[PDB]
Amino acid sequence: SQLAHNLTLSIFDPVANYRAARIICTIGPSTQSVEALKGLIQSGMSVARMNFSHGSHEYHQTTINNVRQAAAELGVNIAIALDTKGPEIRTGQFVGGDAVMERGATCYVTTDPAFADKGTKDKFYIDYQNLSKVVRPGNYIYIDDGILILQVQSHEDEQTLECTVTNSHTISDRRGVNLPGCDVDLPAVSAKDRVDLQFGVEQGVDMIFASFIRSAEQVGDVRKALGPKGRDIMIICKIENHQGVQNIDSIIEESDGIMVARGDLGVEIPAEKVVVAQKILISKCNVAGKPVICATQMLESMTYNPRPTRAEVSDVANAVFNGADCVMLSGETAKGKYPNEVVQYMARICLEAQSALNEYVFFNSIKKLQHIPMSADEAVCSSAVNSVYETKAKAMVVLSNTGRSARLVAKYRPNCPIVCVTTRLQTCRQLNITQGVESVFFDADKLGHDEGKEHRVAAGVEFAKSKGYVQTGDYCVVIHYANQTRILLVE
Amino acid sequence: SQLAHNLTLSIFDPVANYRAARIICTIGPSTQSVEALKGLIQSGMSVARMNFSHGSHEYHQTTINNVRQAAAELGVNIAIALDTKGPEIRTGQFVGGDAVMERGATCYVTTDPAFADKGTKDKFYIDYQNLSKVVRPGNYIYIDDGILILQVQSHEDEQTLECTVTNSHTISDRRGVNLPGCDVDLPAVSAKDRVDLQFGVEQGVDMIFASFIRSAEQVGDVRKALGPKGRDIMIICKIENHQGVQNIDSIIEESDGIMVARGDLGVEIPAEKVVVAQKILISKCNVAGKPVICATQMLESMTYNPRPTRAEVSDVANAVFNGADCVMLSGETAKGKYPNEVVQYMARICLEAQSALNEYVFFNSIKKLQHIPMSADEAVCSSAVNSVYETKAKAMVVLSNTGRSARLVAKYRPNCPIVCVTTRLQTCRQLNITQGVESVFFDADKLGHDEGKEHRVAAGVEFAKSKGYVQTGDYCVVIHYANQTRILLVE
Ligand SMILES: Nc1ncnc2c1ncn2[C@@H]1O[C@H](COP(=O)(O)OP(=O)(O)OP(=O)(O)O)[C@@H](O)[C@H]1O
Ligand SMILES: Nc1ncnc2c1ncn2[C@@H]1O[C@H](COP(=O)(O)OP(=O)(O)OP(=O)(O)O)[C@@H](O)[C@H]1O
Ligand SMILES: O=C([O-])C(=O)[O-]
Ligand SMILES: O=C([O-])C(=O)[O-]
Ligand SMILES: [K+]
Ligand SMILES: [K+]
Ligand SMILES: [Mg+2]
Ligand SMILES: [Mg+2]
Ligand SMILES: [Mg+2]
Ligand SMILES: [Mg+2]
Known part of the structure; x- marks a missing residue:
């Protein structure tokens, strides 16, 4: 039981060697410069959010141009998200x-x-x-x-x-x-937005945070407005009104993921019920395998002070416990005085919560709530994670070009890092919102097709070896849609 | 719970399309002829036991020569077992x-x-x-x-x-x-036996049922007496005395399997305790993955009548429920009046018990009692059976030459037939004592080495298609020591 597992914990217990939860920051006056954006990336930011409720297309352009520049100079893939007005x-x-x-x-x-x-x-x-x-x-x-x-x-x-x-x-x-x-x-889909969205497709944003979503039909209007040029872009629905919560089921079905935008929600519904809603959304996403983001006022006081309150800490951690894939900083980085310190503290609270968690329970709970008979490939990921737990494998390698297989694995919550080897560079950024995954870009246009999977699989294992996940003689589980799974020793 | 699962049963519930439990018969005056031995094979016999406590080496020779002849004429692999005097x-x-x-x-x-x-x-x-x-x-x-x-x-x-x-x-x-x-x-290992055992190695018996085993050291004396010529022959220890039960742990470790020889046991220990012993041995084998045989007086009255008593039925079924891999007929076939009818009834009681069982429970129970961290290959079989349950796969294909991988799969009790493809003909007979497995001989000396596994895997699936386990569009799980697993659709 949960109460039994609480008794086995200790403040001294060593933290995991990797963070699973993904941080998302909002770029503002405090953080638009490349010299600050590099700061956020090294402090722990995975995704940059642009809030299109403020600033011109001229402003957000600079954000885009600098996020990308700071990424390339540090040699990492950082995702860019557009957040609609709605x-x-x-x-x-x-x-x-x-x-x-x-x-x-x-x-x-x-x-x-x-x-x-x-x-x-x-x-x-x-x-x-x-x-x-x-x-x-x-x-x-x-x-x-x-x-x-x-x-x-x-x-x-x-x-x-x-x-x-x-x-x-x-x-x-x-x-x-x-x-x-x-x-x-x-x-339901405003004129200002059709303008904003088409700008996203042109510049090549990785995901859309669709604001004030209330129905399934509404999500279609967004993807249809994105055009055929932006079919590949993800649509994260922000549940922040009365009906959006009530229609969560059908919204999830159409959407690529959910955000619990608590700011607007905490007004639209009685603030105490926000807590119930959080649980419901998150868990419902966990069951589907569609990433969920918790957001707003999680570390509010760090817009002013260099240290969060005991409530604010509590929130970040408890959110990770609830099953959130992503935690997001709004005003805390956009106009905060401590934009690096606020990210570091969140990354640190995430580690601590994640280390004092039993992922094995999450794995069984999720598996139980799956409709038998599973699909061919979903069973493979399921069982291949079941393999990880029995073998105490210290890393996992998945080959997904589109990104589906990667997420479908992360769905079952293993206790090790998931290395995802993909040929497409976009998939690396787009995976920066699903928990406990790291992406390795395999250059297709200068290293060959490799339909034998040999060179790619061994590339993922090298990444694992370099990041210090596996040593010589540890177990690594390898999947490649994906319908074949292998457990191998590492040299 | 067990009580809950009992409420879901019905007498009308259709039986499984395959039998899992393996029948072993004792060849005697009633059953030595080829025309009777064919009868036993079609009635459901998997293994022929020769009791070396009766008859000469001249007699058992004829048994061997006729068992083999009846097998080849019907086109199946039937195992031959020597049962020592002790x-x-x-x-x-x-x-x-x-x-x-x-x-x-x-x-x-x-x-x-x-x-x-x-x-x-x-x-x-x-x-x-x-x-x-x-x-x-x-x-x-x-x-x-x-x-x-x-x-x-x-x-x-x-x-x-x-x-x-x-x-x-x-x-x-x-x-x-x-x-x-x-x-x-x-x-502990008698003179008469060293004679009997060396005869077994020369003629090429598949397994030894070592009588009255009492210690670990004792099992070694048997394998050492078998010589280097008979290293490949299995040693099934017959627990039938006071100490053999007490030292079961270390005996299992040395042995290739256990027989609960209840005849002698039911005298050596207080008859009511035989029941407790049965449970203990069987389950202890189930945990190890070493096949267990239940035997003696299970259908006694069918040496005389053509129909067993309600106790005798109960026994056969309840034995299968206890987790026995094999049920064995002694005097019932050796000197019985109804040697075909006695085998048919056992095969039928086995089906019924097996159909009204929940294998999924057996699978979890066994998995729980495994020392984490599992070995590389054991996890693979575990998870690959976990795959079968989630996907409702109607068959499984394993490539094991020695036979280990096959058994290691059967250890985790899937709800479908396990087709085992092996190049060595002996392994086919030697697998006739592990539950829910069928063996397919892949001729190595006239179909090539096939280090690509391609032709063999597809041969096992053809066997499945021919026996009517899988249709076009059903799931089959394929493993190949074995450290790679795949789930495939069938054409
Ligand atoms: N691009 C920007 N330029 C100037 N100020 C910004 C920008 N982005 C955010 N801010 C400041 O940070 C505050 C919170 O940012 P955030 O992105 O959470 O938007 P918000 O006003 O809370 O609306 P939403 O409900 O969409 O989050 C804003 O009120 C604004 O003052
Ligand atoms: N080869 C044989 N020739 C003649 N009779 C046999 C033969 N095998 C078995 N029988 C008869 O069947 C009976 C039971 O057979 P079984 O193989 O169970 O041996 P058993 O006497 O019970 O000794 P064990 O304790 O080894 O089983 C024997 O008592 C014997 O009369
Ligand atoms: O829209 C949002 O992000 C909110 O209301 O917090
Ligand atoms: O040895 C045996 O088989 C017995 O005693 O039943
Ligand atoms: K907004
Ligand atoms: K005997
Ligand atoms: Mg909003
Ligand atoms: Mg906000
Ligand atoms: Mg005996
Ligand atoms: Mg007997």
Whole structure:
């Protein structure tokens, strides 16, 4: 039982020689330079997220050009993700890049597209036109992931509302406004996004973090909007509203993965239930084998201090325990004072949680919840991981070009690193979001086709030998769709 | 649980398309002819046992020559086993081939080597010389697997005892006499046996059923006596005395397999404890992977009637449930009136027990009791059977020349037939004692070495296709020591 395994732990227990959980960071003013991006990569960042709710196509271009440059200079594959705007509502900019709203103070929310560029604590912009008709005196307006709340007192015209500010808090530019239960009709796939998405395909982003997904049909609209040029790009659905959670089943089916975007969720649903939701999504992904990302406010206080609170630590670790493939840093790196220290601490908390975990349980639990009869190749991965546990193999080698086989292995949670040998360089970046995998690029255009698998398999084992996973005389399990599995001794 | 699985059963449930348990018969006057031996092979006999406690080397020769002839004419591999005399004590022959001892009647047991050829109900021979010194008035003498008991009244000379016969019963020639607790010193490996064993090596017997094994050292004495010429012959230790059971651990280690010879055991230990012993031996073999045979009086009443009692049925089935690889017929075929009917009924009871069993439990139970870390090749077989269960594969193909890999697979109890492809014809016979395996002879001297494994693997699948195990589009798992495993679709 879980209680029995807790008794066997010790603070002194040596950490694993590899990290499994994958870190994702958000690139902002604090982290756009190559000299900072290199910092994040060495500190533990696997994926760079670009939030398209801020900055121009001119800005994100620079992010892309610098992420890639910092990667090549360090000799690693780092993935780039586009995060769509979606059917959100955003405030407008402010004079001084921010506003300081105080408890008791009164403010003005206009829908005048000329209060976009200028924003006081007294008056600012909200980019939903119909706003005046959606609200009544008494109803709240939530600013910034449910932190700041304004109570509506009255109208002023057919554009502006008088609003009591109920709590003190500083807001910067373009904070998300959230209206709970207001049936707020907004383009399931907005015009701004079709623009944003096609830019992603052209520059060659590795994955799309689709915001505010609510239905299966909605995901199709995204992939259809990506065009035939971007069929290879992954679609990670951000579950952050009431219905998205209720329709999780069918969304997972269409999607390539899930993000528990807790910021918006923690407003749209009663905050205590966010916890239940987390569990549900994560585990449901674990069963399917589609990577899951936990995100938002996990290390919030490290935007200011150099050390997280005991709650914040708890969160990161407990998330890894819940089965999250990926943990993600938002404002913590985008505008934080400690962008390297925040990544290091997360990588370290991840190791600790992962070492004090029993992966063997995860393996059996997942296997139990699989529909017998399994497919040909899924059984192979299953059993080949069952092989790892019985043999205490210190590494695994999988040959997947598309990436499927690699993930399908990681699905069954082995207690060793999974080395994935692929000929396609994109697959290496796209695997930076599935847990406990490392990718090795086998250059097809200068080392030959190798339909004998001989040179590739031995390349993966060399990577294992170099990273110090296996020595001379340790066991390594090798799979290659993949329908053949072998256990070999290493020289 | 076991109780839960019992509720899911039904008398109407269709039987498996293959039998797993292996039948072994004893060749006697009823079954020595080729026209009868063919009968036994078609009725379900896998192995022919020769009991060397009866008949000359001239007699057993004929058995060998006819078993082999009946095999070749039917086109199957049937194994031949030698069953040693051991440190036993046997009565002497009788005028009329038998004696009828009645309750109340008085009899004479002489140790005169001239009452060997003539034997009355009044007087016969017992081939232990020291007998007169081992017994006292009051002590019993057990004749014929503990059926007939004589109470010693007095001496008559320095050769003969006066004995009350306490129960009525007919005994034929050379019934085994058993003396409980009498520390009876007898050559651990007797002179008669070294003669018998060397005859086995010359004619080329497939396995030795070593009688009355009591220690590890004792098994060595057998293999050492077999010489370097018979290193390939298997040594099945017959546990049938007090110490043999107590030293089971170390005996298993040295031996190639165990037989629970219950006849002699049921005298040497308190008959109710035979049941506990059975369980212990069998399960201990199951854990090691060394085949176990259950034997003696399993279908006794079918030496006379054409239908077994409800106890006798119970026994055969319950034995298969206990985990026995092999069930063996002794007097039932050797001198029975229904030698074909007795084999058919056993094959049928075996199917029924085997169909109403959950092999999946056996698989997990055995796997649990394996020392982690497993060997390279043992994990492969383990996981490759784990593959069979998840994929509902209807057959398995293993390439083992020596036979080890084949057995090591059968160790983990899959729910399908195991087709074993071997180049050596002996291995086919020697596999006739491990459960749920069928052997296919791949002729090495007229079909080539085939170090690519291609032609052999496809030969095993053809056997599966011919026996109607797999159709077009079913799953078959293929292993080849064996350190590579594949799951393939069939054409
Ligand atoms: N490209 C950027 N330029 C300027 N500021 C940014 C940028 N990306 C993030 N930020 C700052 O970091 C904060 C949080 O970043 P994050 O990517 O989590 O977006 P968010 O506002 O929380 O919206 P979402 O709900 O999509 O996460 C933003 O409010 C913003 O002030
Ligand atoms: N080759 C044979 N020739 C004649 N009779 C035989 C032969 N084999 C077996 N029998 C008869 O069958 C009976 C039982 O056969 P079985 O092989 O079980 O030997 P057993 O006497 O029970 O000794 P063991 O304890 O070795 O089994 C014998 O008592 C004997 O009468
Ligand atoms: O969209 C998000 O990432 C959130 O709301 O946290
Ligand atoms: O030796 C035997 O086979 C017995 O005693 O049953
Ligand atoms: K967004
Ligand atoms: K014997
Ligand atoms: Mg959002
Ligand atoms: Mg956020
Ligand atoms: Mg015996
Ligand atoms: Mg017997």
